[PDB]
Each structure stands twice: as C-alpha cells, then as structure tokens.
C-alpha cells in the first residue's frame, strides 16, 4: 500500500505601496512637511486682501 | 493581506489583519465504452488467418 | 539556538514585522487621502445653495 | 499580586484524540474554576466530574454555591502539553489585562462589571466534551452584573413556588426576549439560598424603619403629581396595594431619642444587609471591561480587554 | 401544449385586502425565513409563528 | 408610555387599563415596564423587511 | 518608562483668565469615557454627563462614575492636559500626588473613595463648558456623610449636622438647591425599604405580631442556625392574587442596583512618606493603589 497527501502552491497578495502624490487629488492641496507641529500653539496665517 | 488606512478619533484604532485560507481538492473521474465484438479478437490474434 | 530550526524561525519572525511595518507606514499616506476628502466635505456647500 | 503575577498550570493527560486537541484550542478565553491556588493541577480536577458533589449531581441553582467555594480563573494560552491560566482573586497579570471571549448571547458595554452564571439559557447550552479522556466541561457564561442579579432573582423566586402546593421565565435586556432552561431544583440548596435571604431580610428592620413606614401614604400621594414617582411602583409592587388599605402611623416617643438618630441607624443597617445581598447570593463582580481602542460594544463571540473591579 | 401544470387551493378569508396581492408576496399569510432572520437561536422559527 | 415624564391619572384601576390596552400588542410598546431611572427598551423584531 | 498617560487636547481660543484656573487645578480627580491615548476635553466636562435635556443629579453622578473611569491630572501643559488613569496607569508607577478639595483632613493609611460634589465649581467662559470635580474624602466617612444627607431628606416629608472626624468640626448645613439636587436618592431609599418591609412581612405574616424579646430570639436563633430545619420555619403554607414572587424580583434588582452605587469602594489609599501624617486641605497627598 502507498498513500500520500500533498500541498499544491502557496499564493499571496501584494500590498500596493501608495505614495500620496501618485494621486492627482494632491493638486487640491499644497502638502508641506513640519518636522514639528505638536509643540506649536499658535496656528494663525495672515491673509492680505 | 489587508491594507489599512489611518483615521482619527473618536471611533477606535484598527490593527493589521491577516487571513490564511485552505481549500481541499474536489475530485472526479470519467468513463468511456470501447467494446469490441466476438470475431474481432480472433481477427486480430490470428486464429482465423 | 545553533539549530537550523531556530535560525529559520527568525525568518518567520522578522518578516512578521516587515509585513506589518510596510502596511502601517503605507497606512499614513492613505491617511492623508482619507482626511483630504473629509476636510473638503466639511467645507464644500451643495450646488443648489 | 506579584511582580510577575501568578500563573497556574493545568497539565493535560497524554492520551488525546486529535479532534479533542483542536477542541481545547477553541477554549482560548474561557473561565475555569480552580479549587485551590496550587501551581500544578490536572484536567480531571478542572472538569465537571470532580466538580460534582459527593454522590449527587448539582442542579443549576445549587451550582452557584459551588462557584463561590472555588476560584475563578481565565485560560490565557493553550499549549500542546498543558493549559496556562491566571486566577482572578489573585492579582491577575504582570500587565493588568486579560482577553475574555464571550460565550454569551448578550453584547457588552464599557465599564460594566462582569459576574458569571452557569449554562442556563435554552438553545445555547454548549459543553465541550473530551471523549478520549471521557471528560465533560461546563463553562460559565460571563454576563453584565445587573443581568446576573436578575437571573439569580429569577431562579431563587422559582424555587419558592415549589414549597407551595404564573409565570416567571421571561427576561428582557436591550429589547431581547430570552427565557431560560430549568426543570427541577434540589430542596437542599434552595434552603441554603433562602436562609441566606431571610437572615439578611430581618437584619434591615431597625427602629427607624417604622418611621419610614409612615411615609407610605406620602409616596402614593406623590405618585399622583410626578411621573418619576410613578416609575417606582410599577403596579406589581406590594406598596401600591399596601398603601391603598393600611394607613400606618408613628410610634411615640422613642427611648433615649435625645441622644440618638433612629432614621440614621436604620439606613446604615439596611446598607450592610439588604443592599449587600446582591453579593451574597451569586459571586462578586470581580471584573469590568475597559476597551483601549475604544469599542463601545463588545460583540457576542469576540474577545475583550479585562481589568479588575475593586 | 406542454406538461399541464397543477394548481393548488388554500382556504383564505374573504375580507383580506386585494392590495396584498398586487405586489409579490407569499401565499402564506406571513413572510417566511430564513433570509429575513437575524443572529439568534430562535429567530428562524420565531418569524413563523 | 415610554416617556415617563407626565403625571398619570389618579385611579390605578383606570390608569393601568389604558397601559395594558395601548402597549399590548403594539409594536413600539415596552416589553418589561419602564425602569425607574434608565432608558426603556423596544423589543427586538425577529426579522427586518 | 512604560508609564501610561492620557493626553487631553484643549481647543484653542483660551483667554488669559481661563488658562489661569486650569493652571491651578493640578491635582484633581477627572473622569473619562474610555482609556485612550488622545482625547478631547468635551468628554471631560460636566455637559458630557447629560441624558437630555436634563443636567444629571446626584443619583446619576453616582451611576456615571462606575461607567466613567477615574483619572488624576498630572502636570498641565499649555498645549495638552496630561492625566494618568488610576486603574491601569498607576500599577507600574506607584506614586501620584493628589490635592484635596475636601475640608476633612487625611490621616496616614486611610482608604479614600470619591464622592460627587454634593457636600459643597469651575466654568470656562471662552470654551463654553463647565467642570465639576468630585470630592476625595475617606471611605468610612463616605458611608456616613451620604447617609446623613439621606436622613435629612426623610425629615423633609436632634442635629444631623454633627460630624467630628480626627478632632475637627463639620457643618453639613453651612442649603437651598442642595436639598432638591438630592431628592431622587431619597425616593429610591424609601421605595426600596418599604417594599423590603412588606414582602418579608408578607412571607412571615407575624414578625411584628410575635412576642417581644424572648420568643423573637427563639424565632431568630432557629432561623440563625445552620441545621437542615429551614423551610418549615418560614413559609405560611375568582379572588385576585398578590403578585409577591414577581415583586421579589423587581425589589431584588432595585436593591441590587443600589449595591453598586453606595458601596463607594476604596479606589485610593494614601501612604505618607517623608512628611507629616496629617494631610490637610489644599495639600498634595501621595497615592498608592493596591498591588
């Protein structure tokens, strides 16, 4: 007598790394980096009209 | 492998989830009928030659 | 240990970080693209008004 | 509590049918009654066979007194050789958190204390069997603490009907209709429950209580004026129909009434016996729920973070 | 023409609204399960009676 | 009758006679009569259409 | 490190008088919905406790503080309020300073429970919310001081104001709105006790009718005993029926409801080290929870 079980293949996903600038919704904002935001207390921007 | 997006509060924080699936082979067979006749054995063997 | 079994187990262990790392470090660029829609919906009024 | 905590180990016998091994791995978070806080025990000590009394199989109402004589503990992780659990009366972990899987029909909310009930309800009666070791495992149902005080009150009031030759089965919570499975109750443990009642019933009656009984005509007059007082009587209390017939009045004058406060002494004796009695019948609500990533509802069939309750 | 279909006959009251029959419905007076039933041990038969 | 704020009428023979004849067997009526402080509950429907 | 710290963010728009009161409130007890890292201040305020429509009374504040989670504020940054929860964050650190809002002094080794401000206030103008801080008074007084205020309300339908702890006077009277704020607790006392003292009096139809001081003790002792003779010492065994057995269950739940309210468990014990044993009003007291 000869018997055996088997494994056939092993399949995975690939998580798509998505840079935000790959989108063109980033036209709608000017996205600039603070290295520090949590220590700031005053968040006012001057507008000249 | 499920991708994640990051939200704020107040509704809670999610962790990365993972899934591992196992599927068993479903097994079938087929059939065919070839059947010969009475004389056709001896016409191939050489009895009636 | 010095065994091949123990040294193979880190490949399961270290890559368990690298799946979770590359998911969460990819979950923040999508975290922008979530809130990017949320801020605009809080600002944009409907057409008929 | 130690600096590392205290973790008991329940060893598994070697004779294992492989389907019963996978049955133990589904018991990831359950509640386990230990008789002692010994460090090493067996599955025969945990299971229902040693959990019986001498010669007599206990019923559902008699199983509550068997709980408070023992030590509730929670399985942390199922190993191939043994089962590691943490006691609850002992300080539970190094970190202060345990996962508990809901084998309960009812979802959980944050902050609510958990008491635990035997398998009582219909349909969901689920007992894990270890047929290679010929063992049976009856695991308790974690429930919110006002629900457990209802179910004990439904069972104990059912047994008082049996001493008197309708109806009391149906409960409600979150709008869910649910009844409970019970056939008979042994006359032994009902007397142990009832004697625990009436001693605590009597010990609330002090001299100030008769002064409080003179305010029965005031409440039935006050329920006319405010609907919040109408939220008391509910038409099923005695005191609505008791106020319709009896007009009591105060005794006078009390002995040494200058030096003492009779209304104050009646309340403090009431708070230590009758308001205590929710602890005396069932066991204590040792555990409440504190989700960390804030989930207001812990769904039925899921784990939950767990922190002790004083 | 084809295979001849078989009608059934179910005793019903006289004074029901005909408007119950102008939409798709059951010949039974109550909607059966088990798609309508939720997550509870009793619900499938509880919808019935 | 879920509201509990308004004062009832005087005679408990009459005030309960309405409360039985309005709640039973209404859909939205309370199952167990209203708790003294808390929010009352609406019974779980066995299925949704 | 590994110490847990909740971070409460203040919404901007604080006027210079408003931040000074929040600068002063350093060691106080503050509740919160769920243990979490970051959280708004809207869940901290007294406005977050409402059900309507209705600002919650003394009864609801006792019910809320079981579901709410106690936390003591640490140092107060102008950016955020850093507070640690008592039930999880303190089990690693061990020592937290705590300032009394109570006028009652604290001895060493005392257990302290929390009481809503019924004994007798901070409001912010610019942020449009109120703050109510509970009173950290000792737990043996806590069962007393609550029960004294209940005893006054029964008189509304000798002096109750005398409370002398560790050589000090107290004046409960000090008035108007304190009585009506407490009215809902008074009615659930009398409805619980009178429903208690009818059902026991119906199941035992002759408790009061039994003879005084000697037969009653003989009725007590056999009921007090452990022996198997239990049920025949109790029970007295168209026309309407008294729904007694249903009135059992509704009373036991209402009595079981008030057990969680009026326990007032010892959340906090104070261990004075390198200092005076007596901790007075307006003084930071060190806190050690159960290990």
From TrEMBL, chain A:
The chain holds residues 51 to 99 of 1374 of the full protein. It comes from the Viruses. This is Major capsid protein.
From TrEMBL, chain C:
It comes from the Viruses. Transmembrane segments: none annotated. This is Major capsid protein. It comes from Human herpesvirus 1. The chain holds residues 149 to 197 of 1374 of the full protein.
UniProtKB/TrEMBL annotation, chain D:
Keywords: Capsid protein, Host nucleus, Virion. One of its GO terms (molecular function) is structural molecule activity. It comes from the Viruses. GO terms for cellular component: viral capsid. This is Capsid triplex subunit 2. It comes from Human herpesvirus 1 (HHV-1). The lineage of its organism: Viruses, Duplodnaviria, Heunggongvirae, Peploviricota, Herviviricetes. The gene is UL18.
